[PDB]
Amino acid sequence: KKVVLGKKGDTVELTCTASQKKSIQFHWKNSNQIKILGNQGSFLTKGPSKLNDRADSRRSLWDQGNFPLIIKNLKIEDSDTYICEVEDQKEEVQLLVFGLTANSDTHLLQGQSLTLTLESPPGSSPSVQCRSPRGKNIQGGKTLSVSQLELQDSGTWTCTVLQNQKKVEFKIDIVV
Amino acid sequence: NCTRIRQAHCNISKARWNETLGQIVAKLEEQFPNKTIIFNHSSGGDPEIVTHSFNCGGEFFYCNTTPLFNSTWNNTR
Amino acid sequence: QVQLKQSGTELVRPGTSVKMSCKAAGYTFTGWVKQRPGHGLEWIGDFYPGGDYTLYSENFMGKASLTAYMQLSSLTSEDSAIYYCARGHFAYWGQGTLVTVSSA
Amino acid sequence: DIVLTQSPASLAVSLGQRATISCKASQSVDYDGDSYMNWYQQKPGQPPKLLIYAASNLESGIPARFSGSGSGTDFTLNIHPVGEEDAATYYCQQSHEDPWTFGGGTMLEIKRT
């Protein structure tokens, strides 16, 4: 089952597959059988779903055998399985939307501690694999903290989030 | 009958539309009698699909028919 | 009724980036213009929501990064002007936002 | 780019008379019978208002007094009869191809007693 990882605010593109290369009808449905977008011939409609204003597609490439599902401003609340229904198949993919950041926005000093906040989608076990230019490649679960925060810790730390062998990079704000 | 330069008016006689709407809703009730039928407007999309469109006299009329499918319906008017 | 509404008056400092917004109503959400005295009207660029397509004139590359929004970078005294939002196909334009580039 | 030249720079017309403004393009704009020229009117404190589009048709809400004629690289915007409210700056713009350029402008002054 195809799985994708979002950054809780970026865009996502859900692509199906086809071979007949004629832009045949297609649909997207969640795990609860809810329509989000829609196709009636060659037009593009948006069904009464929570993702009415976020769904997007590449219409010019419909005749080339693609129907990528572009969604803008990804949020954790939209993580659900979606199904491709081009002709007779039920191809299914999943999205995992979460957010990684830090609690201390700007107020920081030398010799202080640092903590990270991770909000994973309901029903996920993300792992935080921090990577730092100074060699502080912290490894841990969803929540990770740093006991030292000095001037040498300058620069945004890239604490990646990995799960199911799929990993996405992130940045950490550090101002002192 | 719809007539009229970006403004025009279409006519709908509720006195004759109500009968057809009632027949259609009554027939729909058979398929799902346990359900309560509620109408509404479109969910959004292309301007040629969400709002009614037609080609008349070399003109591409787009008429907004929202105030005809939003009202809910029941066994009584 | 096709309607577009832009943000209020803005006063920003040179060298920074200032972002304006234009709202819409009465049609499907899915053009920018600059007017300066002695210059007339200059069509800045065009963009398309629901896919975010970009298009610029020769004198706007790297200067602008565009409910829709616009962001003008490398602000200078020349950018002090009024700006109009206009949904492209320009049927209607925004009322107008006055941008003043000065440190005062 | 397509360069638009307007004429005259400043125009004064008595109330009720005919006001004509010419716009010339550096390149041919006709595309098999159609001209993709636009003419806009602007007044202080207001955004430009589409007066003429397609070079031969009247925009909705625009009085029929406004009209357009010509072809090739020579077009004319004509106002007849001219009124007091017509005082404004008229601009000619080209939609023949990108980049979408604009005219030099032409102010209309309602000459009166």
Contacts with B50 from chain C: Cβ below 8 Å: 28
> In angstroms, rounded to a whole number, what is the distance separating the alpha carbons of residues D66 and D49?
13
Chains A and D share 3 or more Cβ pairs within 8 Å: no
d(CA D16, CA D110): 9
Amino acid (1-letter code) at residue C77: S
| Signed CA dihedral, A98, A102, A103, A105: sign only | negative
Q: Give a three-class secondary structure readout of chain B.
A: CEECCCCCEECCCHHHHHHHHHHHHHHHHHHCCCCCCECCCCCCECHHHHCEEEEECCEEEEECCHHHCCCECCCCC
For chain D, say whether B7 makes contact (Cβ under 8 Å): yes
Asked if the C-beta of C57 comes within 8 angstroms of chain D's C-beta atoms, the answer is: yes
Whole-angstrom Cα distance, residue D104 to residue D22? 11
Round to whole Å and give the CA distance between C84 and B9. Answer: 32
C-D CB pairs within 8 A amount to 28
Determine the Cα–Cα distance for residues C94 and C33; give it in Å rounded to an integer. 10
Q: SS in 3 state form for chain D? A: CCCEEEECCEEEEECCCCEEEEEEECCCCECCCCECEEEEEECCCCCCEEEEECCCEECCCCCCCEEEEEECCEEEEEECCCCHHHCEEEEEEECCCCCCCECCCEEEEEECC
Side-chain half-sphere CA neighbours of B38 within 13 A:
3
CB contact C45 to D (< 8 Å): no
Mutate to test the interface with C, among D100, D101, D106 (most CBs of C within 10 A): D100
Q: What count of Cα atoms within 13 Å lies in the side-chain half-sphere of residue C23?
A: 5
> What distance in Å separates the CA atoms of residue D105 and residue D18, rounded to the nearest whole number?
18
Nearest 5°: the CA angle B37, B43, B49 is 110
A153: alpha, beta or left, given left = phi > 0 and alpha = psi -120 to 50? alpha
How far is it, in rounded angstroms, from Cα C36 to Cα C40? 6
Residue A94 main-chain phi, psi, to 5 deg: -130, 150
- Report whether A164 contacts A3 (CB < 8 A): yes
Interface chains of chain D (3 or more CB pairs under 8 Å): B, C
Half-sphere exposure of A156 (CA within 13 A, CB side): 11
Q: Does A143 touch chain B (CB under 8 A)?
A: no
B46 CB within 8 Å of a chain C CB? yes
D47 and C95: CB-CB below 8 Å? yes
The answer to whether chain B touches chain C by having 3 or more C-beta pairs less than 8 angstroms apart is: yes
CATH number for position C67: 2.60.40.10
Q: Is A70 at the interface with chain C, CB within 8 A?
A: yes
Tell me, what DSSP letter sits at residue A64? G
DSSP 3-state assignment of A167? Answer: strand
Among candidates D53, D81, D48, which has minimal Cα distance to D68?
A: D53
Task: State whether residue A56 sits within 8 Å of chain C by CB.
Answer: yes
A56 to chain C nearest CA, in Å?
A: 6
Å from B47 to nearest chain C CA? 6
Instruction: Name the domain count of chain C.
Output: 1
Are C27 and B46 an interchain contact pair (Cβ–Cβ within 8 Å)? Answer: no
Rounded to the nearest angstrom, the minimum Cα separation between C51 and chain A is: 7
Taking residue A2's Cβ as centre, other Cβ atoms within 10 Å add up to 13
Chain C residues with CB under 8 Å of D50 CB are 90-91
Domains of chain D: 4-111 (2.60.40.10)
Range of the domain at C88: 3-101
Beta carbons of A57 and A36 less than 8 angstroms apart: no
